[model samples]
Target: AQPSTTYKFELNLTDLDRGVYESVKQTIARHPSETEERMTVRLLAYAFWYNEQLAFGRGLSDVDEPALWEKSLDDRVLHWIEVGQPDADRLTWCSRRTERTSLLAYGSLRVWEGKVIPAIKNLKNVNIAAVPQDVLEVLAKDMPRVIKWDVMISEGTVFVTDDRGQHEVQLQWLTGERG
Candidate 1:
């Protein structure tokens, strides 16, 4: 198997609604089979739900874990977050066990929402949202290995910055926009 490539990231973020002013540094591993778009959404998912305990899981490893998850000290899953395309049944499974579940979908909206969204309609504890299709293809396509970035949120729009300049990424929430 080909080894996963590692990227060091530094994020300077300010989320007004969450009232978060944070500087996070993390090293992310991109799986060989995953596209740059998928990996970017995975990283952005972490930033979207920033917390002290929020961390990435072993994605593309079939490890029975989420792309991002936060657990209680007692080993119970507190939050489970999934990026990329995923199944309704899997999020349903997590909803049965976790305090909260969030989906940061990056694929075609109509296809997934037509299928998966309706299946989990009754799940109030689950947050469903999609990242901009443009952001994924644009931001990380040509980026440095060690990326220093700035992210700010006002209203519902996210402003992300790199040396190349900035982009306004507007998120679309299908349901349960919990902070």
Candidate 2:
């Protein structure tokens, strides 16, 4: 079983193309089994791609839930973002239910193609992106118990800087659509 830990961080987002700048404080609870790689990756996902309604989900603690999501004013799920590889069935279910769905995969490309890609191939609304393991590991090194995150994205490139250092990576879209 994984122990529970709390992480507090401040995120400042500046997206050039989106023409948005906002600062928010986030408190994330990490499951004992969660790794620094996944945690940082999730945070980066939130920063690089965010909207007013985006909020954290139950994550690994809930198998049927997304890692991050956004809801409409009436409480309809507008966006669903999953970290790592999720099963095809779950993706199928989510694709049909949400207005938009995306996956930020962080494992072997071969494995993702073999296991995940096939399941959601025909799902026009599901978008998939790959986050390099190297980038995740590099960013993980800078993740501390308390972090001050300054994130900026421009032309599909993401830059994240914390107290430790800066890590830059490009966001690669594998398949599907964005809304």
Candidate 3:
């Protein structure tokens, strides 16, 4: 496997309704086999679910963890947020281990729903959602090694502007919205 490469990003997130506006700078390490689409979705997961305690994980390298997570200082996972479609067993494990678990799935929603939804529907703490495949493709189409992101969130939709162009993605809740 190829060694991981680092990509730096400066993100300005504005969520007027939520009264959240912050400028965040991060350097993300991209795994060799991970695609830009997946990385972009990971960032979107961070923005939409913006939390001061959120953090990145080893992702596929660690089957036991989610792509992003927030943990208590004591080392207990508070929120386990995963990107893409994970297996039913992983979802079950996440719901049991964390207080809350969320999945952000990209690509074909129909396929993901058919395969993943049924198995995890009974987990009350787990919520599943998707970002349209076309929108995800456009967001990552011309992603560069270095990124400056301007993201705006209003209501339930997120708009990401980069050098390539501005793209809008509506986050849909597959299971149910968290209460």
- Pull out the clashing pairs in model 3: none
Mind giving the per-residue lDDT tens digits that candidate 2 earns over 15-112?
89788799988899888877888887789878866887898898888887788998999988888898887888888888887988888878777866
Q: Write the per-residue lDDT of candidate 1 for residues 62-168, one digit (tens) a residue.
A: 65988888989887888988887788888788788798998888878888788987899887599988887877778868666897889987886788898878887
lDDT values, one for every candidate: 0.82, 0.81, 0.83
TM-score of each: 0.93, 0.92, 0.93
In model 3, the Cα lDDT at residue 86 comes to: 88
* Model 1, runs deviating above 4 Å: none
Prediction-by-prediction clash tally: 0, 0, 0
lDDT of 3 by residue, 1-179 (tens): 36787888788999866878999988888898789999988999888778788888888767776799989999899888888888888888778989889888887767668877888868858887888888888888767888888999877778998887788888888886633
Q: What's the lDDT for candidate 1?
A: 0.82
Stretches of candidate 3 off by over 4 Å are none
Q: Please report, as a residue range, the 10-residue window in candidate 3 with the lowest summed lDDT.
A: 170-179
